[PDB]
């Protein structure tokens, strides 16, 4: 267990530094715990780990409480524990550094095993120049595996079960991507520390440059190609590309690091051009029987189709969609609802079912939803808060005593997310830890914080993520939460990050697919120009988030709302009359509005403010929108 | 095989609402060409209305109906002889409506009075303005030389039934009344003699 | 004898890709070939010319300003380059040489104005008379701008060219795409000699770009794939005829290299048979039309 103790030591090497804040005192603290004390761990804490730490590098009461907690608890479980405890403490946080050290160590150990060095310490630290030279030997591999077919797979649906299918497909694709890397890690005897981060549909990892690891990567790519051709044919694919690098490259010397990842993305594009070999292409071509029926969702005929015009995969997806929202545990097991890469299936189960299945068969992989590897996903659904509301679903949202009963679909995309992942970090601070932390924070806000932001609102999140966000909710709630989210996103990012969204209002009976398509167009309007600005209800209404929140919903809607309620002489009909003049846009209506305002007897400052707003083109669109929002709110 | 072209005009005798948002705004719009925004009559609405009227007259499932308007029945796969295209707001109607600044489509304000509370509920619908003309195009495929005449008679009957009926929309309340003016009936493909054929 | 065939559409076209709700702005060469065969069978002409000497191209977007060919799959802001799908004939050499920049690619994408896509919501009232209900369904259509049109290039001997002229004139009344005979796909077509394309085609470049959606024979496939950048497009659908079977039958699933795919070694195509035990053979064009370019 030299590798095991090495990995444990590298993660625990800076445990002493936290004790100091409350290398030697860390080992002394570790000595208190017997399994951690024995063999390599304490020696690594006291002092491959040192070389890995070098490559990585290139109130007391609170600390004391952290130390007490750490003693109370004291490898995957250890890595999950370490991350929660060290996430918000300085070393890049401590976890980030510890994980990166562990990964680098594991890679170095595998490389040294491949080279079969007689004495690692002496070969590395004797001349004292071999430390510098070892940063020049090609020892690491930057590996990227990307899944092709994400959006098409989620939206290759008929509307019949769309709401369900859209939530299930996005979860299935992310869960499948997790399984992939886990399988790869299982093929390398590595841990999650070696995967720097996972993008939705993407996975970046750091691997040893050993011949065994290279052959493992080639075999895994071949097996994944075969499995994806056997299950989804050309609907989904996976491309894996690796690039060799040295310690200096990981240490951002000469600025090559940000280049090298690009080279990996240069190879990935070459894995998607010549995606299929001739034998696979011939196999796709060589159909024998055309088939007598097809699935209404996949539109495939080779696979056996049930009596409900559903293939087994789509039927599984639709069945698993309620479970992913209801049950936290995800179980990669021999028996389960939807197929996974290696002769396994993904079943969503509770804690009792997860324990039953993992003790039943040894090869069961368990993932925990928002809590066994932990996966982060947003499944906020107000309808599930009550049983009858759960039965109603979307219909429960439009059950309003007051306000128009309409569903509001928020489809959103973080602006320049790719620019943020390409040049969002200055070349001065370009490094592995930060690029992993920035992605992890973005994932956490979308997968974890999003549930707290939306808490208390009648909103159901179809899917999350910085790539694409889809929520269906009551319209007044969807707008308010969309504004809350923009303010939170700027705070979370401390600025420099903007989110563009399209908001649409639809009757509950109206089809989800149509809601998704129309709202996609609204999001597109906002995205093409004025990317920070949101588009609400119509193509005509595109507004900056601050404009929508204050210059419309605060400066204009609130006065009008308080005025109408106070006035016994006014009503929706007066507001409709005002709207008709504003909508016509004739110069005479400006004059006719003034006559109506004088007759109306509304407070003078409001009277003048309305008059001024009508004359300004920007204010009038806000005045129209503010009146329309008020009419939707006032209407029973 | 022969193809016979029937090019003509549809005159709107009462406002037409083929159909196919903001509060206090028309609640039902009409079908309009996306680039030109002109109102159009879909080639499926005319085909369906003619088929339904011919079914009511004949009776659907009759062989004449299936051969005129196509059928996908098991063992009775028949191509539709009648290929009715979308009718476009005519250039002449555009010129006349542009003079006098007449809008192509007019909003109609209606309401329903409840039998319980006697409370009116307002609706606004868009109807193509009366006096509008659509250039309608029809193609007949001569699958059988011996059934052309009867088919044309059927066509005539349907058109006659349509002239005393309405096109798509709330036509039982005064909407969609139309008139057909058959400009030509010409053979575009083949040597078939279609001079004697008549729709009206 | 390469003849340009420009199509002007009077009514919107459907051009379904997988479902009736969706729509494409163009159609594959096979979809056009299937329409040409169906027409020839109606007009009682010999299919030997079409099946043995006719070479066609996928219908490509055309504008009064320019004629657009498919974007070649050649390694070169990656978003701007990926968003681009069609390049004008004059800018094709510039794109191949790499002289194009991301902003220029954005301008090229903005340059095309093929048309405005839409979704028409129709209803079926067939069950209303039987105590049933109206059934809403959606047809995705695409309306070309008045200057904008779809063109295709057809190559062959004089006999097949004249047969193509006859079939094309009958086809305009027949229409193309889905929901034809229900209001869509009526087009008027011109066949002319094009100086631009024939000059463009008379180039012997180091790379070959597939004008039509095409697939190589098994023996052709082994040489062709080496160093090929390409996009396998599934070609699937139902059989449209009155005599194939009593009920509607799906064709055998076929995979073809997409237009704009670049192969170092040229492969001739083949009219494959996607029929499965029917009263006639359902032909699927997969022949190859090649634009040789220099990179």
From Swiss-Prot, chain A:
InterPro entries: Cas10-Cmr2_palm2, Cas10/Csm1, Cas10/Csm1_subtype-III-A, Cmr2-like_C, Csm1_B, GGDEF_dom, Rev_trsase/Diguanyl_cyclase. PROSITE patterns: GGDEF. The keyword Transmembrane helix does not apply. Synthesis of cA6 is inhibited by EDTA. GO terms for molecular function: ATP binding; endonuclease activity; exonuclease activity; RNA binding; transferase activity. Keywords: Antiviral defense, ATP-binding, Endonuclease, Exonuclease, Hydrolase, Nuclease, Nucleotide-binding, RNA-binding, Transferase. The keyword Cytoplasm does not apply. Its cofactor is Mg(2+). It catalyses: 6 ATP = cyclic hexaadenylate + 6 diphosphate. PANTHER family: CRISPR SYSTEM SINGLE-STRAND-SPECIFIC DEOXYRIBONUCLEASE CAS10/CSM1 (SUBTYPE III-A), CRISPR SYSTEM SINGLE-STRAND-SPECIFIC DEOXYRIBONUCLEASE CAS10_CSM1 (SUBTYPE III-A). Encoded in a type III-A CRISPR locus. Belongs to the CRISPR-associated Cas10/Csm1 family. CRISPR (clustered regularly interspaced short palindromic repeat) is an adaptive immune system that provides protection against mobile genetic elements (viruses, transposable elements and conjugative plasmids). CRISPR clusters contain spacers, sequences complementary to antecedent mobile elements, and target invading nucleic acids. CRISPR clusters are transcribed and processed into CRISPR RNA (crRNA). This is CRISPR system single-strand-specific deoxyribonuclease Cas10/Csm1 (subtype III-A). It comes from Enterococcus italicus (strain DSM 15952 / CCUG 50447 / LMG 22039 / TP 1.5). The gene is cas10.
From Swiss-Prot, chain B:
Pfam families: RAMPs. GO terms for biological process: defense response to virus. InterPro entries: CRISPR-assoc_RAMP_Csm3, CRISPR_Csm3_endoribonuclease, RAMP_III_fam. The keyword Hydrolase applies. Its EC number is 3.1.-.-. One of its GO terms (molecular function) is endonuclease activity. Signal peptide: none annotated. Keywords: Antiviral defense, Endonuclease, Hydrolase, Nuclease, RNA-binding. The keyword Acyltransferase does not apply. Belongs to the CRISPR-associated Csm3 family. CRISPR (clustered regularly interspaced short palindromic repeat) is an adaptive immune system that provides protection against mobile genetic elements (viruses, transposable elements and conjugative plasmids). CRISPR clusters contain spacers, sequences complementary to antecedent mobile elements, and target invading nucleic acids. CRISPR clusters are transcribed and processed into CRISPR RNA (crRNA). Part of the Csm effector complex that includes Cas10, Csm2, Csm3, Csm4 and Csm5. Encoded in a type III-A CRISPR locus. This is CRISPR system Cms endoribonuclease Csm3. It comes from Enterococcus italicus (strain DSM 15952 / CCUG 50447 / LMG 22039 / TP 1.5).
UniProtKB/Swiss-Prot annotation, chain C:
Pfam families: Csm4_C, RAMPs. GO terms for biological process: defense response to virus. Keywords: Antiviral defense, RNA-binding. One of its GO terms (molecular function) is RNA binding. The keyword Isomerase does not apply. NCBIfam families: cas5_csm4. Encoded in a type III-A CRISPR locus. Belongs to the CRISPR-associated Csm4 family. CRISPR (clustered regularly interspaced short palindromic repeat) is an adaptive immune system that provides protection against mobile genetic elements (viruses, transposable elements and conjugative plasmids). CRISPR clusters contain spacers, sequences complementary to antecedent mobile elements, and target invading nucleic acids. CRISPR clusters are transcribed and processed into CRISPR RNA (crRNA). The subunit probably binds to the 5' handle of the crRNA, helping in discrimination between self- and non-self. Part of the Csm effector complex that includes Cas10, Csm2, Csm3, Csm4 and Csm5. This is CRISPR system Cms protein Csm4. It comes from Enterococcus italicus (strain DSM 15952 / CCUG 50447 / LMG 22039 / TP 1.5). The lineage of its organism: Bacteria, Bacillati, Bacillota, Bacilli, Lactobacillales.
């Amino acid at each position: 267990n030299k590798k095991l103790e090495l990995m444990y030591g590298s993660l625990l090497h800076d445990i002493g530094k936290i004790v100091y804040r409350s290398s030697k005192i860390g080992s002394q603290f570790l000595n208190k715990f017997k399994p951690f004390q024995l063999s390599g761990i304490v020696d690594s804490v006291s002092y491959i780990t040192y070389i890995a730490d070098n490559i990585a590098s290139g109130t007391s009461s609170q600390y004391a409480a952290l130390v007490n907690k750490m003693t109370d608890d004291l490898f995957s479980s250890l890595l999950q524990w370490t991350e929660s405890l060290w996430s918000y403490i300085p070393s890049v946080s401590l976890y980030d550094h510890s994980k990166i050290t562990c990964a680098i160590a594991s890679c170095i150990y595998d490389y040294l095993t491949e080279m079969n060095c007689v004495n690692y310490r002496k070969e590395l630290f004797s001349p004292y120049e071999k430390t510098k030279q070892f940063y020049q030997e090609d020892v690491f591999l930057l590996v990227s595996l990307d899944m092709s077919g994400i959006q098409d797979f989620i939206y290759n649906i008929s509307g019949s079960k769309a709401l369900k299918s859209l939530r299930s497909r996005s979860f299935y694709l992310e869960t499948m991507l997790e399984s992939l890397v886990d399988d790869l890690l299982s093929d390398l005897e590595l841990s999650r520390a070696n995967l720097l981060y996972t993008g939705g549909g993407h996975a970046y990892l750091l691997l040893p440059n050993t011949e065994r690891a290279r052959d493992v990567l080639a075999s895994f790519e071949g097996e994944m190609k075969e499995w994806f051709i056997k299950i989804f044919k050309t609907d989904l694919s996976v491309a894996i590309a690796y690039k060799a690098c040295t310690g200096e490259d990981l240490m951002n010397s000469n600025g090559t690091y940000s280049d090298l990842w690009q080279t990996v993305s240069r190879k990935l594009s070459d894995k998607k051009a010549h995606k299929y070999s001739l034998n696979e292409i011939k196999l796709f071509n060589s159909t024998i029987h055309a088939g007598t029926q097809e699935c209404k969702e996949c539109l495939r005929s080779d696979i056996d189709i049930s009596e409900d015009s559903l293939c087994k995969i789509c039927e599984g997806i639709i069945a698993i969609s309620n479970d992913l929202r209801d049950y936290s545990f995800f179980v990669v097991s021999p028996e389960g609802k939807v197929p996974l890469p290696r002769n396994r299936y993904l079943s969503v189960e509770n804690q009792d079912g997860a324990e039953r299945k993992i003790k039943m068969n040894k090869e069961t992989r368990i993932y925990s939803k928002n809590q066994v590897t932990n996966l982060w996903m947003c499944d906020y659904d107000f309808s599930t808060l009550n049983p009858e509301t759960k039965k109603q679903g979307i219909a429960s949202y439009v059950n309003r005593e007051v306000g128009i009963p309409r569903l509001g679909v928020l489809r959103a995309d973080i602006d320049n997310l790719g620019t943020t992942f390409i040049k969002g970090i200055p070349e001065q601070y370009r490094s592995i830890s930060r690029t992993a932390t920035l992605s992890r924070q973005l994932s956490m806000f979308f997968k974890f914080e999003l549930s707290n932001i939306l808490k208390g609102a009648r909103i159901s999140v179809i899917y999350s993520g910085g790539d694409d966000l889809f929520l269906i909710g009551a319209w007044d709630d969807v707008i308010s939460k969309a504004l809350v989210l923009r303010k939170a996103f700027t705070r979370f990012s401390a600025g420099k990050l903007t989110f563009s969204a399209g908001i649409g209002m639809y009757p509950v009976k109206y089809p989800i697919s149509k809601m998704a398509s129309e709202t996609g167009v609204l999001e597109d309007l906002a995205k093409r120009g004025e990317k920070n600005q949101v588009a609400l209800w119509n193509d005509s209404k595109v507004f900056g988030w601050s404009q929508l929140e204050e210059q419309i919903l605060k400066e204009k809607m609130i006065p009008l709302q308080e005025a109408l309620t106070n006035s016994q002489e006014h009503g929706k009909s007066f507001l409709y009359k005002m709207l008709e003049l504003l909508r016509n846009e004739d110069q005479i209506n400006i004059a006719r509005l003034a006559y109506l305002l004088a007759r109306s007897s509304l407070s003078e400052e409001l009277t003048q403010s309305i008059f001024a707003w009508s004359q300004n083109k920007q204010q009038k669109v806000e005045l129209i929108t503010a009146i329309e929002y008020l009419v939707y709110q006032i209407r029973e | 095989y022969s193809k016979i072209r029937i090019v003509g005009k549809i005159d709107v005798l009462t406002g037409l609402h083929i159909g196919g948002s903001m509060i206090g705004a028309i609640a039902s719009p009409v079908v309009r060409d996306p680039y030109s925004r002109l109102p159009i009559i879909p080639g499926s609405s005319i085909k369906g209305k003619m088929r339904s009227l011919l079914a009511k007259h004949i009776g659907q499932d009759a062989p004449e109906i299936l051969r005129l308007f196509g059928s996908s029945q098991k063992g009775a796969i028949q191509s539709s002889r009648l290929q009715i295209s979308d009718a476009f707001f005519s250039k002449a109607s555009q010129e006349e409506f542009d003079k006098k600044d007449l809008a192509y489509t007019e909003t109609k304000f209606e309401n329903t009075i409840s039998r319980l509370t006697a409370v009116a509920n307002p609706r606004q619908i868009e109807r193509v303005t009366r006096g509008a003309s659509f250039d309608f195009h029809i193609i007949y495929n001569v699958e059988n030389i011996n059934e052309v005449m009867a088919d044309f008679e059927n066509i005539k009957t349907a058109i006659h039934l349509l002239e005393n009926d309405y096109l798509g929309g709330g036509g039982t309340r005064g909407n969609g009344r139309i008139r057909f003016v058959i400009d030509s009936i010409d053979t575009v493909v083949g040597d078939f003699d279609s001079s004697n054929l008549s729709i009206k | 004898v390469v003849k340009l065939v420009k199509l002007t559409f009077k009514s919107p076209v459907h051009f379904g890709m997988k479902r009736l709700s969706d729509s494409n702005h163009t159609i594959a060469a096979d979809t056009l070939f299937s329409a040409l065969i169906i027409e020839a069978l109606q007009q009682q002409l010999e299919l030997s010319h079409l099946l043995n000497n006719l070479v066609i191209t996928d219908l490509f977007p055309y504008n009064k300003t320019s004629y657009f060919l498919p974007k070649p799959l050649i390694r070169i802001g990656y978003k701007a380059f990926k968003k681009l799908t069609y390049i004008p004939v004059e800018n094709y050499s510039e794109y191949l040489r790499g002289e194009i920049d991301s902003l220029e690619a954005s301008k090229i994408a903005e340059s095309l104005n093929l048309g405005k896509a839409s979704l028409s919501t129709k209803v079926s009232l067939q069950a209303v008379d039987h105590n049933g209900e109206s059934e809403p369904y959606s047809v995705g259509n695409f309306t070309f701008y008045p200057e904008s049109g779809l063109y295709f290039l057809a190559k062959g001997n004089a006999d097949t060219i004249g047969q193509l002229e006859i079939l094309m004139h009958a086809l305009q009344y027949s229409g193309i795409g889905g929901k034809r005979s229900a209001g869509y796909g009526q087009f008027r077509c011109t066949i002319e000699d094009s100086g631009k394309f024939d000059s463009l085609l008379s180039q012997t470049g180091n790379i070959a770009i597939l004008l039509s959606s095409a697939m190589a024979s098994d023996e052709e496939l082994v040489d062709c794939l080496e160093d090929a950048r390409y996009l396998l497009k599934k070609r699937t659908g139902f059989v449209q005829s009155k005599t194939y079977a009593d009920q509607l039958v799906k064709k055998k699933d076929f995979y073809a290299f997409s237009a704009g795919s670049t192969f170092y070694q040229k492969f001739n195509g083949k009219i494959f048979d996607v029929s499965d035990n029917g009263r006639h053979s359902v032909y699927r064009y997969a022949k190859a039309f090649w634009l040789e370019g220099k990179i």
